[model samples]
Target chain A: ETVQRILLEPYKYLLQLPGKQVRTKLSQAFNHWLKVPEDKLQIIIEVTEMLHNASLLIDDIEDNSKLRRGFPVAHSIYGIPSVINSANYVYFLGLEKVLTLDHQDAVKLFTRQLLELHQGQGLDIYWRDNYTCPTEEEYKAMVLQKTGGLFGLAVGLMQLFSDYKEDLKPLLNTLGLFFQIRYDYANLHSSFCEDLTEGKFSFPTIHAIWSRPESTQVQNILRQRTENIDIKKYCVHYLEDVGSFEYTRNTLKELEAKAYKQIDARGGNPELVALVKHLSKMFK
Target chain B: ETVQRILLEPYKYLLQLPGKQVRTKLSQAFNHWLKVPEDKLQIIIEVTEMLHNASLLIDDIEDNSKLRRGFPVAHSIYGIPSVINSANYVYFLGLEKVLTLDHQDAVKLFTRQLLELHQGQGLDIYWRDNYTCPTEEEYKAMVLQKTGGLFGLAVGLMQLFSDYKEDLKPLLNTLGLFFQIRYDYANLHSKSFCEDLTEGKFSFPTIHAIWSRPESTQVQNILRQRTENIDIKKYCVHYLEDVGSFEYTRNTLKELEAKAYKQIDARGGNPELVALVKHLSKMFK
Candidate 1:
């Protein structure tokens, strides 16, 4: 109880804040898809807590992230060994909930998501450390991993609450991919340039590099993967020499159009309708 | 799928081999006492994965360990980021299994273990990082954390399978404490003294230090925290002067007998039963 309040009070309190409110928004969307009971809302919240904690734990360790949400890292504040173990115990709590859930199929679907999250994280780790400026295909593989998997899970969990629909899974998966790609473009072209500098291996830069003609020396420059220590100058040079920032802006509009068409083909989804309209305006 | 397989495959292979063997043995001891079936064995295996992975992950990072059972450390093979993420994922897998298990009451009991594990780990981390040394009470607190919680989980898990009385939880907790004390005795008196020196915290040695009534100067020296780079000679002399090695073993046996008798009575467990007899003898073993 002591550790729970210390570690989790912030997250629980933040639940009331006004923002995307994506979870409750989706639960409302869930009513449109199926007559899910009011009671299941608690289960969804519990699962979301698991997802949120899992992401924070991995992200903090990955970034050696000293400052998390403006506070010292969980590992730093609690001590690394304790935090890691504590995170495990938290994860166990989430799992226990799933195991004993009234819905067996929900547990099965949720377990698959948990596995997908791990696989995605593995791909992220592999690409960041091993590949020397991975190809567009390579980066797409990673985007599906690092970002898309969790986003897919977020959508898929709602889908599971509905009956396991064949059509919904693919659509949500695509939406997740598009959402991740849009973020990639936003970061690559933005002033912060963190997507490139952080060695994140996002899709926009990969697409830009791969689309450049072979005769051009863009490939040669990209072949030399930049270290995080030297990433600022490295990404700046690539942006200037390969494709000016304007070229990347045009590409973002292209992805925006592609995302719209994909959502339209999905036929009927109020949540996606809102998401698609929101995303279309976002790039501009 | 890719990342999950990369990490999970190795673990799966390791578990498939030893796990089946362990369950078969456990069945021999436990089948008569409770309602464990084959599937129950499977659930325990799944739960054990979380416990095993947590222990391995902590040890790898703490010991700065390079390899695990001959394979390269996950962090070493994968980047530290991926390794950390994968380890977290592994724990999630175990937790997922527990939550999704068919049994509801087992879920609640196991969740209690999960909470206890966190509290225990919190204290272990606190003790390892803070304080130059502590008296005997601090040492027990550390053991309760770093070791005892898991012991409780293991036995409690076993008990969950049994038709055991509901009143046995406290006795089981005490038994967990007693086994940890025994483990502390064996490890503290072991030939290698470097770990205690490196951490420079109270161990079984602190118990001896208090008893020896070391001089003010030696006490002052013990009070000073050792850094990541402490002199080996200093650790050896401090322990020897405090008569730590002998006292650790003696106190270990002394407490083990007393606690064992108390637990046996508390649980009303038959002292002569082979499984019970074997468990009681393991302290000396």
Candidate 2:
């Protein structure tokens, strides 16, 4: 009993103070299409919650983060070892939860998407650590897998219980891009630039560099992993100067519109449309 | 791809250094009884290496360790995030490797031991972090889960491929008991002079010594200090010696060895298995 309490403390901390819950909201909205049994949907939601929250625990450590949802990171409180193990323990726990669903496809789909999630994560971390500037298409390809996997996991798992079998990959692909890019833009626009300090090759930084490939100006600033607010603001303005932020916002809108088209043509979902607007409303 | 190399750097860094092949040696000894085919044996060996290497990489970080195998720990070179990610990535990759066997039972058993491995680890951390001293029986349970997790993972997977279905776990369980107690003994007697005492681990010797005088704070108090003073450690070692804790541990090791050998005898014994036991037993002398 005490062992579980000690191991799950870090994970429980993230669950206590919830995010805007894009994952939950998205899962809930997609359920309208699938209309799974309340019991099974509830189970699916619980498993989704586990993977989503658990990944953040690792992501916090992996990103060397200071704050999550405006609170100190889980690793900062629990210390690294327990936090790492805690996150990992929940992953297998989530896998265990899937078995009770008794679907033949449940475990394999869970593992496959989970594997995709890590591959995408590895690629993202690789680019940041190596200071490599991936092309815009390269960056989008990474986002597709990173965000796309989770998006697909929710819808894919939902499809297991539903009558709706039409391919929704295109919509998932577009929405995932919009979702990740929105965070990249929001992260850069925050009072302090976390992505800059993280040395991540986010959307804006990539564009600014590609705007003039000869310039290592943005590249050098990122490598410093600067905490200097002055430097961060200057880099933010430089991104604006090169028309990168405008270009990124335009890209978000383009993807957003692409989602609207797919959603509308597929008997447009008001709940999902409301979600798309709610997410985009922040930057607008 | 370049991405893979970057992610695997931390794990690969550890692979560059070698540790004593207690795990490999045990598997080979067990294979003599099971008689699994060579190709399957090779795959099982590779999977075991991934899990062991990955587990230690995390263990080093969990212990806030400085070095592993006398080189800088993987986290020290690659940084924590990548190292954490790498260790996790390989875990799934190992799962992917097991799927090649196309055996229905393999994946379920793989999940079962990995789960047990963490449960044991969780208990150990709880005791250490909370400054709780586990009872001797409690410590035994933890070792079975922790040490037996990997030990059983190797043997269990091999059992799937072999004709032997005679429940080798009792033998395997004793092996885990022997290996950990041997390590507990070596920490005080062999390596770095009472390293377990320094780490505040409730090792078998310390557990025996603590219970030997339940009313006494002499050993208990010293453990809480996590003392670095050599005089104190030596004094504690001497105290354990006086209390017959060392002798008790030696007796325990001898009994575990005899039980393991006799169990093998029932299974139509192997000379290689006996030799391996002899090789492991040499440390005490």
Candidate 3:
């Protein structure tokens, strides 16, 4: 097959998946970065591709996810050997890309980028293992690690790509933290709650959960949900009334507002700044 | 902990496993090369240590092996992630030792050395999938590719390490083939008959069974093995009575004798070669 045809084939299938317009948002953000220097934009693009592939690999393994983006998950389609090797292949590719740059600061930036995501996974594993309800901060930390980490790192790495002279790393770190909080507001109520249903602890629900004296009843409903039944109705009620799901959602909104206020002050391209504003507004 | 202490700790436990004194053979071989030069032995020792670790790690992961040298395997004890990473540590250490050698030939020798072992594993997986059953000559080819490849490389590499400039590679390869064939002969009738049975292959018994097809009794016995069980006792009798196991043993003796003669003819060693003759002769007894 022609290289062009081969390259376009995967995207042709992926574009047809019924995902929320996250990929569209990525394309838009990528377009704004293309106006910057080519090297700078390349870092953003490469990092995005790496992050996307890494998540699919880990998610497939974790979820034993059969179908993804309307095709077999990497493990199911390719078998365990290929799936594991491909994960390593892309992992080393990402690591090698960062290491190749002569700048020490770029390497530091790259390592810093993964900290939140890895930490979030650690916390998620910890919570699931212990079956303890998490506090609002704990849940937020998980969100920052899991969802926010990738988003923050992409933007943060882009910030590092162009500038080495000044250390605006503190500002970029804050931006990563803030973007995660906003992501917390949107993802927590739906998928975050789903994480709870799957016996996974999310920041909001866990914060709201164990604090309540009546939290045992909510735990009971969660325990009852196995293969035979749908507990979505009972889960929402328990989440709202006993588990403090609504309370966590409110806290998430407050954090989202705080994030936008910080992003607005840090300041970048006005049009890019506007795009951030528009995306942030959708959460509330 | 001290480096020596750390290295010796694993070996303390490793010594409890069922193994022959092959390290003695290694020491004896080194005595030959070092007798004249007396200097190039240290790097070889360190490189051997690194290669031993590599073999252990790969063996553990591939077999999902529960034990090694009578201890819990590395992956079984350390967890998969840590085991995988630790294997890389051994690999990187091997590379460092290779780089310490001051010759490009030495580096090429080390890098290409492991290619055969990995290729054998690929072949093993392929054969497992396809159930590739070859006749006797093809079986010898498979064994050479899979088993003798690394052993041959190791022998030839030692010559390169000693600066034996002429290509003694074919000699080394033949020695490896000779040793492997000797190994099969020694155990093919006895304890390692299970190698054939467990690997689910058309082994030596099956080959004997094939050749004796028109003879109904041998054919019936081989066929009955599938439904009932492998009569290892009866099969060994069939193998011995038909081809005679001693005759196969003589082939290995011939190969080893030829190799020893060729090596001496090259003016490689006399009294030093006497040490190898001592080591090889003791094995038959």
Candidate 4:
């Protein structure tokens, strides 16, 4: 009894905390198109949340995060060993839930998407650890795999039951690129340069690196992983000086334009457009 | 082109080093009965090693290990982020390989065993972090889940192709218990015997000694010490010997070894499996 409870504590702790539940909301918006039955949609939503939350637990550990959602991370509370074991357990738990779908291709679909998720995550981490700045195109490809992976998984599973067969990947990848770049842009403008502290090569930082290859200022600050507010601000100012922030904003606008076009081609859904509006509200 | 090449670096680093290849040999031993066809067996073997090696990488990270197989741990070299992603990615890759088996129940089997593995691993980590000493029976149960899980997967997957239908879980779990107790016993002998102590782990003998007196907090205190003091280690070792915890563990190992052989004989006597058992069992003395 204690064994099972202890294992679930870390995962459960993360679930109780407040989150945007953006993925859940995104799935519902997409369901406007697929129109999968209610009961099965519930299962897919639960499965998505399980995989998403578990991956969050793991992400904090991998990123060596001190806090998540304004609280000390689950790894800090539960210790790395239990958090890891628990998150990994829930991953399988999510996969096991997929079997209830009773679809032949469901397992294959889950495997493919999860594989792509890790692959994208691998490259992201690879770039960060190696101090390698991915070019804009390389960054877009990674976002397509990582964020697009979850996006595709939700819609892919939903479409399995629907008559709608038009490939949605182009639209999904567009949104994936938009959302990730937006978040990267958002992180740079946060109270601290959060991505800089993380030594991450976010879109702005990557752009700054590419634009002024001779300037080691941004690179050194990120390498220092400094908590010094001044250094963080200087890096932010440097990004502005180099037009990286402006470039990121322009790229986001272009991606949203292209996404709206794809959605129109597929006979645009108002709810999906509304969700995009809600996410885009921050930039203003 | 090199996405996989870089992604698998941590996993590959661990693979390049030497291990006993005990699981591979153990699988071959069990194959004596299953006789899975050549090509399919090759797939299963590769899948098993992929899962096994990838898991070792994760285990090192989770265990806060510094070295594996006398070399720096993969995480220590590749960094935790990449190693963790690589290990988890390989886990799915292993699941993907299972799909190539083309058996209807293959995915279900893969999921089942991997679930038990994490369940068992979860408990083992929980107890150590919590400093909760499980009873000898609890330790055995966790062993069966953790160790038997991998053992069960190999046999269960092989049994998919063969006509042999008798459940060998009891035997597999028995060996799991044996190998683990034997391992715990030898850890005290020690490849880092004090490792369990430093990790604040409740291994078989430590559990036995703790329960034997039930009043003496001696072993418990040393465990909580998590000390590297050679004096503390030798003293704990001496205490384990004094309380006959070592002797008790040896005797228990004997009982388990006998029970396993009895189970093997009842299953029409696998000489190869028995030989592997005997080879691994030499440390029991």
Candidate 3: tens digits of C-alpha lDDT, residues B42-150:
6655666556556667656664545565568656655667556566666667667767767678777766766766665566455433555446566556656656545
DockQ of all models, two decimals each: 0.01, 0.01, 0.01, 0.01
Candidate 4 residue-wise lDDT at A95: 96
lDDT of 4 by residue, B216-255 (tens): 4557766766666565577678778988999999998889
CA displacement after TM-score superposition, residue B38 of candidate 1 (Å): 96
Q: State each model's CA lDDT, in order.
A: 0.55, 0.85, 0.53, 0.84
Candidate with the larger lDDT of 3 and 4: 4
TM-score of chain A of 2: 0.97
For every model shown, what is its TM-score relative to the native structure?
0.43, 0.51, 0.41, 0.51
Task: Specify the CAPRI tier of model 3.
Answer: incorrect
Every prediction: chain A TM-score: 0.74, 0.97, 0.71, 0.97
Clashes of each: 10, 0, 1, 1
Whole-model lDDT, model 2? 0.85
Q: With candidate 1 superimposed using the best TM-score fit, by how many Å does residue B39's alpha carbon deviate from the native? A: 95
Per-residue lDDT tens digits for candidate 1, residues A12-49, read 32232233645445546544555555566567656655
